[PDB]
Design a protein around this ligand. Sequence first.
Ligand SMILES: *[C@@H]1O[C@H](CO)[C@@H](O[C@@H]2O[C@H](CO)[C@@H](O)[C@H](O)[C@H]2NC(C)=O)[C@H](O)[C@H]1NC(C)=O
Lengths: 49, 44
Amino acid sequence: NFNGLKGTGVLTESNKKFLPFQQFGRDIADTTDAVRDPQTLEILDITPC
Amino acid sequence: SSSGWTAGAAAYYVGYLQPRTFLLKYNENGTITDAVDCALDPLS
Ligand SMILES: *[C@@H]1O[C@H](CO)[C@@H](O[C@@H]2O[C@H](CO)[C@@H](O)[C@H](O)[C@H]2NC(C)=O)[C@H](O)[C@H]1NC(C)=O
């Protein structure tokens, strides 16, 4: 429930760099892939298992 | 002083914005590298 992003998946570790204002990653299908954890700042790739 | 002032060179340029459709080509990172306008050319 990361801030209003309901869904089911596996929160792995990724290696992409975010700009200071960009928060939500996306793709062609407009489904969120990369979300930055609200309390600690890092990258968590979202993949359905 | 006021009657004749010597200062360094400077320049400021002003343009004007008009509504258009753009294409943006994102890099492997989040930086925007190229942009293409549509109302410029037949090839565009
Ligand atoms: C995208 O970002 C990556 C790193 O986040 C850049 O990769 C590094 O770029 C510097 C500067 O050119 C090099 O000194 C490093 O050797 C690069 N690292 C690797 C592992 O290759 C990359 O240049 C950026 N741009 C693109 C188009 O990928």
